[PDB]
Amino acid sequence: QASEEGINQEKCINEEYKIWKKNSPFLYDLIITRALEWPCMSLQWYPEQQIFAEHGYTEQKMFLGVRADVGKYLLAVASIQLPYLNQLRVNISNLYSHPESVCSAKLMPQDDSCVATVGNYHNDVLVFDKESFESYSSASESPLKPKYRLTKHTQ
């Protein structure tokens, strides 16, 4: 009996889908849909930018924290192609496993290398820096360790 409601609901979710998909070329000037591996808990745009004028685009950067699974909690960096006005893919890379969960991962405004990460699973704030990302090696069995551990809270 509850199936009926759930399946109807899922179906109109699908409905909204291609009814947005169908009239997209009359609504947007750009659409890039990416089916990443994992659920991305957060995103933050990167203020540094590459401009490939002769090639004809720009790449921006993105910082994601995703879960692969329960307990598999990871971070990644993406490069994003935007087209050029003045005269096309989403690339995942830089994937480092996190010690515990990420609910919010904020990078310092005037220095990208640092990221304060916290999650719904721990009361400790873990702040990462240059060396922590660059001393990590994807071949290693252990995750990173942040620049500092900040703990005052109990939740």
Partner: protein
């Protein structure tokens, strides 16, 4: 010369309106003006709003005033009062019943007296029981009066009655007034003035007829005073009117006689008339459509537990009856007068084709056909055509069965066939209708009364078919039919793309009608499909259902089987390099879409003081709208 219709457009108003359109600088402005008028007609456009838009399109004051004068506009406080009706008009049905219709009276109603009752009548008459008739509530099969040759006679009789009452009134008034006109009238006036009070009504009615209900009182008074010189002018007028009306009645009685002859003969048949009237009132285009629509609407919402499915079902057994119908059709077609020489061939061909192709009438590895029901998709015209054909078939077949099973006219070799040959004769013009009907009367049967309706049914059918032959969208449609008469056993996707073709060939507004043929049972089923409806209602297992759905989601313009009453549109109703890498993943038990990872979809379209000033207007209007150490800190931070 040419006749003026009621409330016909006058010349002044047509002149003024064409000058209005001329002042309107564009034909687009004229079209907008027609739109204003039409939207006011369709109860979406108010009066004052019509005036306002008219002025904001005409930009001229005198024409606005002329419109407000033509629109008959008046701004006053509309007063609405609600007055209940008197207690005695409904109170009876609260009285303590005694029988079905007789209800005991309450003491407050046995409290008024009749003053001429003696001691007898206070013991015979009934005092405390009323007769409260019963009240229908929601009658839903209304009978009509079908005899239309009886009502013409009744109209003749009413018209001559109305002439008579008038002529008689003017006669009597002429008599009295002419009595009041003489030389010696001034002498003995108080006697004539007494024969006028005793006859005031006849003269009042004569005045009402000759002048009107406004001048009647005037003339009556003015003659009560100035009698011996008012009487002659009235007499002259009334005699002139009388003469002309008598002259008119003569010349129209010239015609009443012919009416009475013809219809008096042909009006002693309340058998033929009920049948024919109910028939003709049944097979009206809009009535057919409304019937099927009502049934469909009752299904969609499950009002009485009725679930969706088919709305019309009927079995067509014989295969020769169709050839009989074709025979009758061609017989009548050679004797019509609407269509030119080639349309006869066209319509005969179209009927033959749609009969043979669809109905499959000749003009462990083979059952797959009889298991696949053949599908036809069309619009209202096709549905009406097929309803007519099924009705004609049903009536012919009932005729044949009744001729055969009934053991009186079956004893002849071809009684049914005799009927067929007689109808053949008649439809070509070789026999008239009187012999036809009197010969029909031999059967004494309403079931055999039903044979005459074939001419009407065929006329409607020919009309539909012809309007299809001029329907330029017909071709593909029937051609599409031809196409789907070649498959062996269809997989859904073919039928769905067929249906999408059909639904596309029509305008965006239309319905679809689905007609399905089961040659195993030889059954015709009809249904009505709107955008988001299921074409195949029966699935024997959830896996089959999921398969058909996914196929539909793939191809079908709008997913079949989804509750449109629940969709909520997700947007407000207001050198390029593109690469698509997306696979729609489905579950088979929850229908959730997933995506296979590493999917890229990109859409690219290659094609300031305004923004800052809008920002500033925001700041300004919003600030205009607007008008503890915390305030200390803030005011340290303010400017």
């Amino acid at each position: 010369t040419a006749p003026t219709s009621p409330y016909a457009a006058t010349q002044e108003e047509l002149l003024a309106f064409t000058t209005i359109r001329q002042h309107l600088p564009d034909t687009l402005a004229f079209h907008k003006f027609l739109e204003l008028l039409h939207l006011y007609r369709e109860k979406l456009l108010d009066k004052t709003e019509l005036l306002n838009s008219f002025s904001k399109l005409v930009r001229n004051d005198n024409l606005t005033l002329w419109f407000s004068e033509f629109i008959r506009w008046s701004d006053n406080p509309i007063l609405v009062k609600n007055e209940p009706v008197d207690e005695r008009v409904y109170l009876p049905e609260t009285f303590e019943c005694i029988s079905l219709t007789y209800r005991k009276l309450p003491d407050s109603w046995k409290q008024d007296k009749c003053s001429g009752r003696d001691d007898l009548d206070n013991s015979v008459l009934n005092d405390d029981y009323i007769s409260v008739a019963p009240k229908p509530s929601h009658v839903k099969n209304i009978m009509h009066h079908e005899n239309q040759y009886l009502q013409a006679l009744q109209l003749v009789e009413d018209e001559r009655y109305d002439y008579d009452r008038v002529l008689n009134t003017t006669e009597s008034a002429i008599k009295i007034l002419a009595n009041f006109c003489e030389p010696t009238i001034h002498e003995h006036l108080e006697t004539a003035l007494q024969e006028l009070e005793r006859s005031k009504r006849i003269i009042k009615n004569a005045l009402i007829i000759v002048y009107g209900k406004e001048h009647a009182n005037l003339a009556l008074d003015t003659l009560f005073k100035k009698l011996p010189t008012a009487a002659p002018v009235l007499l002259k007028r009334i005699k002139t009117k009388d003469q002309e009306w008598r002259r008119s009645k003569r010349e129209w009685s010239k015609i009443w006689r012919q009416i009475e002859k013809k219809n008096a003969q042909a009006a002693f048949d309340d058998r033929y008339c009920r049948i024919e009237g109910r028939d003709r009132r049944g097979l009206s285009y809009s009535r057919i459509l409304r019937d099927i629509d009502d049934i469909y609407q009752r299904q969609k919402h499950r009002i009485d537990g009725a679930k969706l499915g088919f709305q019309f079902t009927q079995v067509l057994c014989d295969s020769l009856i169709f050839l009989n119908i074709l025979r009758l059709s061609d017989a009548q077609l050679t004797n019509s007068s609407f269509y030119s020489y080639a349309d006869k061939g066209r319509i005969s061909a179209v009927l033959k084709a749609l009969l043979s192709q669809f109905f499959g009438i000749p003009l462990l590895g083979e059952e797959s056909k009889n298991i696949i029901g053949y599908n036809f998709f069309g619009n209202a015209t096709m549905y009406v055509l097929f309803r007519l054909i099924c009705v004609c078939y049903s009536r012919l077949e009932h005729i044949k069965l009744f001729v055969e099973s009934s053991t009186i006219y079956a004893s002849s070799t071809g009684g049914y066939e005799n009927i067929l040959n007689i109808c053949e004769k008649y439809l070509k013009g070789s026999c008239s209708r009187l012999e036809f009907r009197k010969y029909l009367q031999k059967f004494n049967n309403e079931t055999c009364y039903m044979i005459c309706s074939i001419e009407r049914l065929l006329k409607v059918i020919f009309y539909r078919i012809h309007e299809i032959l001029l329907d330029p969208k017909l071709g593909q449609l029937l051609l599409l039919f031809e196409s789907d008469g070649a498959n062996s056993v269809t997989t859904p996707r073919e039928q769905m793309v067929y249906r999408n073709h059909v639904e596309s060939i029509l305008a965006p507004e239309s319905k679809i009608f689905n007609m399905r043929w089961y040659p195993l049972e030889k059954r015709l089923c009809i249904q009505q499909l709107l955008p988001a409806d299921l074409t195949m209602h029966d699935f024997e297992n959830p896996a089959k259902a999921f398969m058909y759905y996914v196929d539909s989601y793939a191809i079908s313009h709008i997913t079949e089987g989804v509750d449109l009453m629940q969709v909520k549109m997700p947007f407000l109703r207001r050198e390029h390099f593109c690469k698509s890498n997306l696979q729609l993943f489905f579950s088979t038990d929850t229908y959730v879409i997933f995506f296979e990872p590493n999917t890229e979809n990109v859409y690219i379209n290659s094609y300031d003081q305004s923004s800052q000033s809008k920002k500033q207007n925001r700041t300004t209007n919003w600030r205009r709208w607007l008008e503890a150490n915390t305030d200390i800190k803030f005011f340290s931070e303010t400017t």
